Amino acid sequence: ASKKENLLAEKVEQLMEWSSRRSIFRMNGDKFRKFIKAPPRNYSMIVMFTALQPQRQCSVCRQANEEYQILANSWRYSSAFSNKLFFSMVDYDEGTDVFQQLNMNSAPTFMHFPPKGRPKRADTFDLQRIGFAAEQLAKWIADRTDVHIRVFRL
Known part of the structure; x- marks a missing residue:
């Protein structure tokens, strides 16, 4: 019941909610x-x-x-x-x-931001090597997070 853990639970609850009307959160700075x-x-x-x-x-x-x-x-x-x-x-x-x-001078880029620390090298998806098929994005997310998404339809 710390202030922090209440904050954290409150954040997660705001995300959990927003993702009940939009599967992708559109962010500004x-x-x-x-x-x-x-x-x-x-x-x-x-x-x-x-x-x-x-x-x-x-x-x-x-x-x-x-x-x-x-x-x-x-x-x-x-x-x-x-x-x-x-x-x-x-x-x-x-x-x-x-x-x-992020020193980005081009687009698109896919990144994973872990819960602690900064993104690692592998947390930038290698688009120029792999392409951007949803199933390849999913493979990469599994490698980085151990969350396995089964894409339907392609």
Whole structure:
């Protein structure tokens, strides 16, 4: 019943809830900091950094978004055995300060933010080697978190 553990339980409850209307949490800088950067956390976060506004003309962003949606929706269909994994996105035009902080000069990028510490090397998905099939994103998430998502349909 510490202030911290009540805070933590309150955060998780806010995420658990938001993911009951949207399988992917659309974040600006403030939201990214609150739910990803700020302690405490006991959950993993997956983030797709993207640039989906038409003026950015990022075709790969658009294609990868479709597979990310397929993946997050597969998870939302069959989880809630877990409040330990959540999915989010940061769009360049909504979180430009986050891209700057992460020294991102391109898109899209998928990252895993563990509950403690900083992302490790392997916590950046190797898009340029693997491509972005939902099933490959899932394999990578399993490797990093031991949460295994069965993608339906492809």
